[PDB]
Structure 1
Amino acid sequence: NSNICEVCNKWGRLFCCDTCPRSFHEHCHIPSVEANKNPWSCIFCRIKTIQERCPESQSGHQESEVLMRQMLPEEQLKCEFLLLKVYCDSKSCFFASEPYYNREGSQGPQKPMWLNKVKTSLNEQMYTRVEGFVQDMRLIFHNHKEFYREDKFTRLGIQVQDIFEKNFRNIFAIQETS
């Protein structure tokens, strides 16, 4: 197994996957690493099994059809994995916890949103369709863009949104376009 957390890249109290060499902090894995379960398989492993069981699940899909999907167990898992892929970027720190807004010339967003709130919402099964989760994720970056205006700090929202969007297209096998 690796000697660092796959998500945050630090050592510590790590739980090792039984089917691949990754390790995790307890609350870095999504969902949080399960109490018992020997062998234990990480989210990466569980996603790869889905693909192996249904190779046609990798054929291209339309984003509009993906969004309307109900959050059955396989879609729940895919959204957890996509959330986890965002936390894997170190720049996710800026978007993890509850923000506050007091900048000359700007007003805070009407609907603040942050990664740990999305994580809670997934854990609590509050999204009934893929669209719910994707809307809250894109709201994070849109609020950041609007608040920071011409400050160069706006670029951190562009960067982390690009990681979200590339991983969304991969995980949900969105049809490639020009």
Structure 2
Amino acid sequence: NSNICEVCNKWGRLFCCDTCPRSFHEHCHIPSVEANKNPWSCIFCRIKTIQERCPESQSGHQESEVLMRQMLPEEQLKCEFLLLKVYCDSKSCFFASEPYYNREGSQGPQKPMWLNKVKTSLNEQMYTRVEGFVQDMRLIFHNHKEFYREDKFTRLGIQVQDIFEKNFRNIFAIQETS
């Protein structure tokens, strides 16, 4: 197995996947690495299994159909994995914890949002459809763009949004377009 966490790229107390060489900190893995379960398969392996069981699940989909899906176990898992993919990028530190807003010439967003809040929400089964999760995710970046206006720091939002969106199109097999 790897000797660093797959998400944060640091060593520490790591849990090793039984079906692939990845390793995780307990709370870096999403969901948090399970207490017992020998063998244990990580989220990457669980997502691979879904594809393998139903190869046609990789044919193209319309985003509007994906968003209306109810959060049954497989969609729950896919949103967990997509969230995990954003945390995999070091630039996610900016959006992880609860933000605050005091900048001359700007007002804070009406509905603040952040990764750890989406993480809790998924854990607590607060989203009933994929749309719930994707809306909160996109709101993180939109709040950032609006607040930081013409400061160059706005680019961090564009950058982390692009990671989210690429992973969304991959995980949920959105039909490719020009």
TM bucket, shorter chain: over 0.9
- Tell me the distance in 1 between the aligned counterparts of 2:176 and 2:113: 29
Q: Secondary structure at the match of 2:162?
A: helix
CA deviation after TM superposition for structure 1 residue 68, in Å:
0.1
Q: Displaced runs of 4+ in structure 1, greater than 2 A?
A: none
CA deviation after TM superposition for structure 1 residue 143, in Å:
0.1
- Tell me the distance in 2 between the aligned counterparts of 1:26 and 1:19: 17
CA deviation after TM superposition for structure 1 residue 165, in Å:
0.2
Normalising by structure 2, what TM-score? 1.00
- Tell me the distance in 2 between the aligned counterparts of 1:34 and 1:166: 28
CA deviation after TM superposition for structure 1 residue 16, in Å:
0.2
CA deviation after TM superposition for structure 1 residue 92, in Å:
0.1
**Residue deviations 1:129-149 (CA, integer Å, cap 9, x gap):** 000000000000000000000
Q: Secondary structure at the match of 1:117?
A: helix
Please name the residue that 2:86 is paired with: 86
- Tell me the distance in 1 between the aligned counterparts of 2:68 and 2:118: 18
Structure 1 residues not aligned, in runs of 5+: none
- Tell me the distance in 1 between the aligned counterparts of 2:148 and 2:25: 32
CA deviation after TM superposition for structure 1 residue 49, in Å:
0.1
CA deviation after TM superposition for structure 1 residue 113, in Å:
0.1
**Residue deviations 1:65-89 (CA, integer Å, cap 9, x gap):** 0000000000000000000000000
Please name the residue that 1:15 is paired with: 15
**Residue deviations 1:100-130 (CA, integer Å, cap 9, x gap):** 0000000000000000000000000000000
CA deviation after TM superposition for structure 1 residue 169, in Å:
0.1
CA deviation after TM superposition for structure 1 residue 168, in Å:
0.1
Aligned residues: 178
**Residue deviations 1:3-26 (CA, integer Å, cap 9, x gap):** 000000000000000000000000
- Tell me the distance in 2 between the aligned counterparts of 1:64 and 1:171: 15
- Tell me the distance in 1 between the aligned counterparts of 2:136 and 2:163: 15
RMSD, aligned CA: 0.1
Structure 2 residues not aligned, in runs of 5+: none
Residue identity (%): 100
**Residue deviations 1:142-166 (CA, integer Å, cap 9, x gap):** 0000000000000000000000000
